Design a protein around this ligand. Structure first.
Ligand code: ATP
Lengths: 250, 243, 238, 234, 273, 242, 233, 239
């Protein structure tokens, strides 16, 4: 019971080049492919669940996660450096904002409250960074949709569309064709899947890969009734079947 | 090579060789055993003399932790005594609780994770000792040995020091000869045989013996060292087994 | 590399890398007339799909008389503003007057060497531009660096060939050089130092200060895309 | 920060060389007056010097400082020095002496020596001023080791070797500085050997009793420097 | 050995094959031309007919291709080492050859040398790691500036060369041991204009030709790219069986440079703005 | 390339024994015992004339009746004397009476040991140890004018007299030859000057050095710049005679 | 040739050794001697002192803990002092909590429990000396040995440090003899003194180079130093 | 880099790939399945010396009256995980009033392993785990852990040095009857399938003592003793 590693684990280069994050962003690429696109009607994300054995479930693993009733997120790279991060954000949306202004926050203010710990993983002592760069979706009645990519250094890009991982640049070479402005959502799944078909060698079934979306108000989820005022959970995930119903429909 | 320099640095083999060096430190120490009799346990140990100037019978190496226990060790004299001073207060902070004596599985469950804690960190020394303990609870008889990697298993007998190879095969030569049940008094004879039988790795030097047992029968399952002719009865016997 | 200690001949191992590292970063300039202020920055990237429209990155504000610019990490600078913002309004609940700058920086950057000085922690990969006004010293302009030493100026650059770019202001700047006579120097100061001479309104970011409101009020005016897009034509690019 | 086998310290056989790089400044102890004088970057263009941190600084109504070496590690001391000034005026109800805060800050430059993960300063400083309710001048010089001395003249900076001996062909104990015009002539007739430029590259300041501080223009300098720019001729 | 020596078989180049380069000849000929053209003229003052000079600049230039033509229109000799051939897998072979080198030019005052590369004799450091090559840079410089070099510097000017500058020994240069240096930069656009006029002399009473309309576009560094695009432009005509050629067939040849002008992929790392 | 709390194969520590030659860089500082008084002496190491050597203070005054003299590294020792002043005065409170010397001086050498396991329950201050040593002189009414010596290794001896610093290994030999029981005070106010005149790098002045006696009658006393000079002539009263 | 296992403490050897410790125990080998022994009724301390020059006073070797205890050391004073000042609290604490005054042997079994709390933590060295403890209780008289290891043992009489084997040998030559002594400490004391002449590398003991201080079944701790030891030389 | 938990030059963690291999010190294989309304878990029990008390030896623990777990690793490293389980059940129900599930409690101890990879005062643990329980909301289930945090359920699984010998053998089975878990009710009459599969696929024959068993009965977890196993072994009397 004694702490003596309180130095920084971080190191300057001669020419900037902070070392042990620049090595980190290999594993983010070594990890799986995953993406995210918006449109005025709604927003989408997706990944590919690489079930190792023929034994493991995919129900137990959340390669997609809920943040609030109006947000989702997704990663590539490492998992255990993702699972922890959710709860340390969920506990923050309340313990700084949500129990203090009532309403849940807009999307970016949350993002100020994940980089503000991701940063502390580096400039502090006795620690490493999370080998993860993840993605957020946006909604609010005062600023609208958005995506926001983050990264272990502490930055956060905004976007209109992007993707990451072992097939990233090819997608970024692709989607700059597919994207445009005149966009609903029901179209966006074709391109999103059609993208994510080319960058795979294994099976391509609905019970293999999970994704989720940003729909509109869905009070059936809300559980209770009577108040016409409330805005239900815009966030939502899909099932096994509804994936395949798209796939047959190609 | 370059991974064998500090605590908590696993190998490609999947180990930390440093504690495996500890095993050679405890290898550089005295003989010591303790036997699971039919109703209790026994303790006996090697205690070598350098000069006549060392007094006999003022320098025990057994330690007691509480009434119903005896414990010994071998190798590093101080380090094997520290955790006793942890032991002597822990169970005391357990009889504090439900007002009953402590089990033996309570002992190792309250020790065998301790020394582990001295192998997690890059700031401490693994307890370079192998260690024994025994005694009685409501349930009956017990016995255990420790090794510096935290491990421990319930034996019928044990051995340490450089009295390993003699006793282990010997107890293999004992048990089949007498599996039916060995009461307390009788093992006090047969135990002190082994130490006279095991000094031959170091018969350049001399010593004198030290014994303790504890019986549910005899001593109300309390701890009680030997001091009397009964010891002298055994040394008169144990010379014959080597005669 | 043991941030505390010095060289064998009176120098440092790390920090000379830092203000040399930041040279990799973008550009952020800042000038002053006797009439008004201009600022500029070229975003490190100007790809097309992402939200360069509302991308407020290089230029933040602190209160209703001040604006800055940024150079360095996205994050290790992103905290100082939340810090220093408080030290502004926490000046006010004591005193209720507006804040001057000359207290701020002198009472801010001393945090910097506090991490050069001890803890074994790295310094901050950041430098700033400053801008604002008090009623006692007129218009103002300041800068900083990861060391802490701050310097008043009339016009400054940072980043890529700032030493080169600072030349470009050397001959052309005028004492009474008005705003609309000085604004064009900025993007012209950047119209040369650019890597991509192919230039886009998207790629940069902009800000202003004036005293536009009568009764001596001011304006922390910040400029949107299609405005500066049309301003860009005024000096006659296309 | 430990002991070598040559009785020295690594990090502090180093540090005091840092002050041997930067600017150069000096003061003196006149017959009944005390003065300072320091350095500036001429050719620093597109700038207004009204607001830059002067190498001079003031600590009380009646005392001042002139650092050298670094600039960051200078700003910190003035603050916690200022505290001790406008605190010492409170508990004891009397203002400071000169040696008190000098004795203080002589101690802080080793409170920031002997501990874990703490560099000493790239700073050396001196002070000047008259005690309250007295007349005799007082000036003290400092360096990171803490040893505080009382030099009748003290300079720390570039080309300073001959400057450290230039005075000794100029100053006389039993022939002290008569008046300001000569004592400031002394203040400048030293520093100008490293100036190598006009008046714009310096800044000076002076003290007299009851907090009679003055700072002098670039033009007042161009009054007197000419008189030896005229007397550097014959 | 005389294989390194100059040639009765001079190359056939010329310093008017060399468009865009206009000023440098005036800035560097004279040290190689004038006081050796007229030592009595120089000796009217006789300041110092300096030692050699040096040229720095990237590839894409033809610093070589300049140095091929200067060996025409000389009045002097122009020897060649075939750079770095002087060294061998031994020790003693170094200094003797350098001893043999100077004397080979002492007998010819109006005569000079050529290096191309001094990246392999640069920045000597030694603590056990190093090499005999560092031994030879001394003696040449020794016999450059010694009791027996100024008599060569009476007889001689020389030149060195490379493509990477600041990666060598500064202890080499006593300025005066090398009295002048110069940049061979990449060209201007309009400097590029007269280039393709040189090499594409193959049009066949054609028309609709706008030679200016290519350095219209370029942001490169080389001038040789004017040939790399030109040389493969005719390849199109070469394959399609029609000897003739035009602008557009000549223009998309930059599509080969569509790689070069765009091969430099870029990182997305917004760690710092 | 050694550390603090690590022995060698030879047992002789590195740093503290290296701390036992930094003193040999510094100045000279001597005090000699007479049974009717004790002296103290110094070598200012004055480097330039303009300086005003009233400010350099190699000599102090604990109380009205005790003084000491620091040598080696004059900077750091400026701290520890304030410790001694605290324990002196503190002992002047709980008992209303001046302290024995040996009750004090154990404390000071109980301070410099603090770099690892000081007295009972001591948190490790003093990342490095004091690179300075000094001499203590004064009366208490139990043993006599018992001079004391301190060095930062954390031990003290009692002496008749000896020296430190630059002139240590050579000068003391004369002192070893030329001290005895039945000498005076002022003979010791001058015998030092026969010595210090040896190992100064220039002819003596009244300002190179300075002196201070100590007496159970008056107590503590520093002299003046001139009252050293008058006895130097008294030394030259023998240097010119003999 | 260059054991890298020579740095901080916790690193074991590849053979079961702490090279710091073993390289520490030779310290006392470079330190002096201080011997001691006992009867069934009376025990002794002895110490050569080691003087600086012809002028200095002498380095001390004996300290009293309390009215029924003393000790003597070897090698280092300062790390050895604090243990003296340490256990005074653990001998006052007895006589105030209980008033059932302090038994000697548990002190050693406290003392061994100190140093071991200094080896297995980063930072900190051993209290690197050997020393000798004495005194009396209801159980008779007892002598002890100390090692910075932690090993402490109940002995009849022993020796320490340089040149000590000569005196060490007298005891095995004589352990038949001195154990049967009582109420007559004078001749007892000179046993060691004659016996430690075996160590003298021609320094020829004096009035003041020696310090003696003993204890009995009656005597509180007394020191015989200064000029009272003309009795023995 | 090869002594601590920083990110590698390329970007793996050499101090962690070791730890997986720190498990395989024992030459031991264990197995996990799902019943119909029950479960099963087993492993070798080696005893290469004569003097033990195999009453004492065990890897299979008891945390509630509900659940259980197993280990293939150094037991000292196990016990620190073993103890921290019993704690982290109590503090759950004491704060919410009902027993500790598995899916959560792995999601705790999987969070826990991460902050042993994210700091450097700590030694990680060279073990892995296979928790077992019924669930009133989820039914028979298990969950596995690595020392990094990767935790996932398994319809049925195993572990040891010899996963390849059997893990193929099981996947061949479900491609012969094709359902998740077995179509047999009583736990007593499905353990036979386990021990039928080990020795046959690539395993070696066993005796009474050689094996040990756990069962997560409805509202009951518990081990098994000698004749309780010998009887269940003599099911092979018929096959
Ligand atoms: N203005 C020009 N006139 C003639 N040739 C040119 C011109 N610009 C470029 N070149 C071409 O450049 C080529 C060589 O130039 P470059 O600098 O790329 O290599 P180099 O000088 O041969 O290399 P090095 O100097 O390292 O030996 C020649 O083929 C030459 O035709």
């Amino acid at each position: 019971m004694t702490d003596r590693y309180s130095f920084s684990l971080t190191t300057f280069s001669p020419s900037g080049k902070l070392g042990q994050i620049d090595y980190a962003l290999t594993a983010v690429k070594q990890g799986v492919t995953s993406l995210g696109i918006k449109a005025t009607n709604g927003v989408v994300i997706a990944t590919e669940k690489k079930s190792s054995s023929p034994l493991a479930m995919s129900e137990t693993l959340s390669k997609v996660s809920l943040l609030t009733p109006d947000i989702g997120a997704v990663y590539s790279g490492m998992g255990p450096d993702y699972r922890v991060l959710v709860d340390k954000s969920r506990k923050v949306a309340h313990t700084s904002y949500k129990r203090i202004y009532g309403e849940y926050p807009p999307t970016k203010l949350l993002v100020s409250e994940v980089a503000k710990i991701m940063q502390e993983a580096t400039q502090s002592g006795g620690v490493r960074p999370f080998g993860v760069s993840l993605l957020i979706a946006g909604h609010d009645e005062f600023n609208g949709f958005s995506l926001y990519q983050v990264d272990p250094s502490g930055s956060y890009f905004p976007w209109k569309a992007t993707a990451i991982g072992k097939g990233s640049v090819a997608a970024k070479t692709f989607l700059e064709k597919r994207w445009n402005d005149e966009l609903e959502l029901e179209d966006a799944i074709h391109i999103a899947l059609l993208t994510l078909k080319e960058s795979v060698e294994g099976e391509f079934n609905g019970d293999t890969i999970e994704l989720a979306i940003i729909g509109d108000e869905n009070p059936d989820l809300l559980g209770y009734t009577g108040i016409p005022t409330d805005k239900g959970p815009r966030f939502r995930k899909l099932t096994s079947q509804e994936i395949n119903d798209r796939l047959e429909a190609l | 090579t370059g991974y064998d320099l500090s605590n908590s640095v696993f190998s490609p083999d999947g180990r930390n060789f440093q504690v495996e060096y500890a095993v050679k430190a405890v290898e550089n120490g005295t003989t010591s055993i303790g036997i699971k009799c039919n109703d209790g346990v026994v303790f006996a140990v090697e205690k070598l003399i350098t000069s006549k100037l060392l007094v006999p019978q003022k320098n025990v190496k057994i330690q007691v932790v509480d009434r119903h226990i005896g414990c010994v060790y071998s190798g590093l004299i101080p380090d094997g005594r520290h955790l006793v001073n942890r032991g002597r207060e822990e169970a005391a902070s357990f009889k504090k609780l439900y007002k009953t004596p402590i089990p033996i599985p309570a002992f190792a469950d309250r020790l065998g994770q301790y020394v582990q804690a001295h192998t997690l960190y890059n700031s401490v020394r693994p307890f370079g000792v192998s260690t024994i303990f025994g005694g009685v609870d409501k349930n009956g008889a017990h016995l255990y040995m420790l090794e510096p990697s935290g491990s421990y298993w319930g034996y019928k007998g044990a051995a340490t020091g450089k009295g390993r190879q003699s006793a282990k095969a010997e107890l293999e030569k004992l048990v089949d000869h007498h599996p039916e049940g060995l009461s307390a008094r009788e093992a006090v004879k047969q135990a002190a045989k082994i130490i006279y039988l095991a000094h031959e790795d170091n018969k350049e030097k001399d010593f004198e013996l030290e014994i303790s047992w504890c019986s549910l029968s005899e001593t109300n399952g309390l701890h009680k060292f030997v001091k009397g002719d009964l010891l002298q009865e055994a040394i008169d016997f144990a010379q014959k087994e080597i005669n | 590399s043991r941030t505390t200690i010095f060289s064998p001949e009176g120098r440092l191992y790390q920090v000379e890398y830092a203000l040399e590292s930041i040279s990799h970063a973008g550009t952020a300039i800042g000038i002053m007339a006797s009439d008004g202020i201009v600022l500029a920055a070229e975003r490190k990237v100007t790809s097309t799909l992402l939200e360069q429209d509302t991308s407020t990155e290089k230029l933040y504000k602190l209160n209703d008389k001040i604006a800055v610019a940024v150079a360095g990490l996205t994050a290790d600078a992103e905290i100082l503003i939340n810090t220093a913002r408080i030290h502004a309004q926490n000046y006010l609940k004591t005193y209720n007057e507006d804040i001057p700058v000359e207290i701020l920086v002198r009472r801010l950057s001393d945090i910097k060497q506090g991490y050069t000085q001890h803890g074994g922690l790295r310094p901050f990969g950041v430098s700033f531009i400053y801008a604002g006004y008090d009623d006692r010293y007129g218009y103002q302009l300041y800068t900083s660096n990861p060391s802490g030493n701050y310097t008043g100026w009339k016009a400054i650059s940072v980043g890529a060939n700032t030493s080169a770019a600072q030349t470009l202001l050397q001959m052309d700047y005028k004492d009474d050089m008005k705003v609309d006579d000085a604004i064009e120097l900025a993007l012209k100061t950047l119209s040369k130092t650019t890597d991509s001479s192919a230039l886009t309104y998207d790629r940069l970011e902009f800000a202003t200060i004036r005293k536009g409101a009568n009764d001596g009020e001011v304006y922390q005016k910040i400029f949107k895309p299609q405005e500066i897009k049309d301003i860009l034509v005024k000096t006659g690019i296309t | 920060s430990i002991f070598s086998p040559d009785g020295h310290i690594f990090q502090v056989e180093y540090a005091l060389e840092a002050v041997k790089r930067g600017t150069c400044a000096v003061g003196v102890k006149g017959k009944n007056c005390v003065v300072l004088g320091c350095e500036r970057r001429s050719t620093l263009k597109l700038q207004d010097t009204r607001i830059t941190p002067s190498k001079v600084s003031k600590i009380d109504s009646h005392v001042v400082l002139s650092f050298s070496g670094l600039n960051a590690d200078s700003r910190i001391l003035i603050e916690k020095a200022r505290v001790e000034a406008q605190s010492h005026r409170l508990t004891l109800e009397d203002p400071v002496t000169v040696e008190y805060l000098t004795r203080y800050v002589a101690g802080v430059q080793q409170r920031y020596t002997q501990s874990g993960g703490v560099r000493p300063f790239g700073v050396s400083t001196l002070i000047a001023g008259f005690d309250p309710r007295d007349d005799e001048p007082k000036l003290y010089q400092t360096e990171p080791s803490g040893i505080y001395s009382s030099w009748s003249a003290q300079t720390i900076g570039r080309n300073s070797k001959t400057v450290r001996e230039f005075l000794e062909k100029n100053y006389d104990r039993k022939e002290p500085p008569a008046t300001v015009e000569e004592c400031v002539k002394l203040t400048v007739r030293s520093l100008l050997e490293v100036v190598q430029t006009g008046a714009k590259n310096i800044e000076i300041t002076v003290v007299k009793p009851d907090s009679d501080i003055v700072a002098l223009s670039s033009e007042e300098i161009n009054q007197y420097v000419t008189q030896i720019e005229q007397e550097k001729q014959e | 050995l005389v294989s390194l020596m100059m040639v009765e078989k001079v190359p056939d180049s010329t310093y008017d094959m060399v468009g865009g380069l206009t000023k440098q000849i005036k800035e560097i000929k004279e040290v190689i031309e004038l006081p050796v053209k007229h030592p009595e003229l120089f000796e009217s003052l006789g300041i110092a007919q300096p030692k050699g000079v040096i040229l720095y600049g990237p590839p894409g230039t033809g610093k070589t291709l300049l140095a091929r033509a200067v060996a025409h229109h000389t009045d002097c000799k122009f020897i060649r080492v075939s750079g770095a051939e002087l060294v061998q897998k031994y020790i003693g072979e170094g200094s003797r050859m350098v001893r043999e080198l100077f004397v080979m030019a002492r007998e010819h005052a109006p005569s000079i040398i050529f290096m191309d590369e001094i990246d392999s004799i640069g920045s000597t450091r030694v603590e056990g790691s190093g090499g005999g090559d560092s031994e030879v840079q001394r003696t040449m410089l020794e016999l450059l500036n010694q009791l027996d070099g100024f008599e060569t510097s009476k007889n001689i000017k020389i030149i060195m060369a490379t493509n990477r500058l600041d990666i060598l020994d500064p202890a080499l240069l006593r300025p005066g041991r090398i009295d002048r240096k110069i940049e061979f930069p990449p060209p201007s656009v309009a400097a590029r204009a007269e280039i393709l006029r040189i090499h594409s002399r193959k049009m066949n009473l054609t028309r609709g030709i706008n030679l200016r309309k290519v350095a219209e576009k370029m942001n490169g560094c080389s001038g040789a790219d004017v040939k790399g695009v030109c040389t493969e432009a005719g390849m199109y005509a070469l394959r399609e069986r029609r000897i003739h050629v035009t602008q557009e067939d000549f223009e998309l040849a930059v599509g080969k440079v569509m790689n070069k002008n765009q091969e430099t992929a870029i990182s997305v790392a917004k760690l710092f703005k | 390339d050694r550390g603090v709390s690590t022995f060698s194969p030879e047992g002789r520590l590195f740093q503290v024994e290296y701390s036992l030659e930094a003193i040999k860089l510094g100045s000279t500082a001597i005090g000699i015992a007479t049974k009717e008084g004790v002296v103290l002496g110094v070598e200012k190491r004055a480097t330039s004339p303009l300086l005003e050597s009233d400010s350099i203070e190699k000599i102090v005054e604990i109380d009205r009746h005790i003084g000491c003299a620091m040598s080696g590294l004059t900077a750091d020792a400026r701290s520890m004397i304030e410790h001694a002043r605290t324990a002196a005065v503190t002992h002047n409170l709980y008992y209303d009476e001046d302290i024995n010397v040996e009750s004090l001086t154990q404390s000071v050498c109980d301070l410099a040991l603090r770099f690892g396991e000081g007295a009972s329950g001591e948190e490790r201050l003093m990342s490095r140890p004091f690179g300075v040593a000094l001499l203590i002189a004064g009366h208490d009414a139990d043993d006599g004018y018992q001079l004391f010596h301190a060095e930062p290794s954390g031990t003290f001896y009692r002496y008749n007299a000896k020296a430190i610093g630059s002139g240590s290994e050579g000068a003391q030999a004369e002192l070893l030859n030329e001290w005895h029981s039945s000498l005076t005070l002022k003979e010791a106010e001058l015998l030092v000057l026969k010595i210090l005149k040896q190992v100064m790098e220039e002819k003596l002045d009244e300002n190179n050095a300075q002196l201070s006696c100590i007496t159970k009658q008056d107590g503590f006393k520093i002299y003046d710049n001139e009252k050293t000079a008058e006895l130097i002539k008294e030394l030259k009263e023998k240097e010119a005679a003999e | 040739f260059r054991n890298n296992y020579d740095g901080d403490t916790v690193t074991f050897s590849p053979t079961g050794r702490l090279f710091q410790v073993e390289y520490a125990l030779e310290a006392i080998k470079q330190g002096s001697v201080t011997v001691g022994l006992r009867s069934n009724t009376h025990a002794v301390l002895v110490a050569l002192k080691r003087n600086a020059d012809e002028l200095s006073s002498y380095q001390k070797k004996i300290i009293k803990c309390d009215e029924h205890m003393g000790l003597s050391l070897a090698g280092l004073a300062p790390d050895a002092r604090v243990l003296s000042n340490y256990l005074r609290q653990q001998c006052n604490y007895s006589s105030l909590v209980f008033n059932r005054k302090l038994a000697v042997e548990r002190a050693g079994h406290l003392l061994c429990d100190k140093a071991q709390k200094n080896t297995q933590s980063y930072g900190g060295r051993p209290y690197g000396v050997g020393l000798l403890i004495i005194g009396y209780d209801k159980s008779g008289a007892h002598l002890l040995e100390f090692q910075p290891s932690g090993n402490v043992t109940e002995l009849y009489g022993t020796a320490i440090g340089a040149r000590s084997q000569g005196a060490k040998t007298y005891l095995e030559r004589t352990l038949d003899t001195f154990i049967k002594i009582d109420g007559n400490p004078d001749e007892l004391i000179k046993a060691g003194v004659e016996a430690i002449s075996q160590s003298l590398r021609d320094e020829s003991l004096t009035v003041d180079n020696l310090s003696i201080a003993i204890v009995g079944k009656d005597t509180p701790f007394t020191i015989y130093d200064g000029e009272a030891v003309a009795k023995y030389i | 880099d090869r002594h601590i938990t920083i990110f590698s030059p390329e970007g793996r963690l050499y101090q962690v790939e070791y730890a997986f291999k720190a498990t395989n010190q024992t030459n031991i294989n264990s197995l996990a399945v799902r019943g119909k309304d029950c479960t099963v878990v087993i492993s070798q029990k080696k005893v290469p010396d004569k003097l033990l008390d195999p009453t004492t030896v065990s890897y299979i623990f008891c945390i509630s009256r509900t659940i259980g777990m197993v280990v293939n690793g150094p037991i000292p490293d196990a016990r620190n995980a073993a103890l921290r389980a019993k704690a982290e059940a109590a503090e759950f129900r004491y704060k919410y009033g009902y027993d500790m599930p598995c899916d959560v409690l792995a999601k705790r101890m999987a969070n826990l392993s991460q902050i042993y990879t994210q700091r450097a005062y700590m030694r990680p643990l060279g073990v892995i785990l296979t928790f077992v329980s019924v669930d009133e909301e989820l039914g028979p289930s298990i969950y596995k852990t690595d020392p990094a945090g990767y935790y996932v359920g398994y319809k049925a699984t195993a572990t040891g040095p010899k996963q390849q010998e059997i893990t193929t053998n099981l996947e061949n089975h479900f491609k012969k009857s094709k359902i998740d878990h077995i179509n047999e009710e009583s736990w007593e009459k499905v353990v036979e399938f386990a021990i039928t599969h080990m020795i046959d696929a690539l395993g070696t024959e066993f005796s009474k003592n050689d094996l040990e068993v756990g069962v997560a009965t409805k509202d009951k977890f518990f081990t098994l003793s000698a004749e309780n196993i010998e009887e269940r072994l003599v099911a092979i009397a018929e096959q």
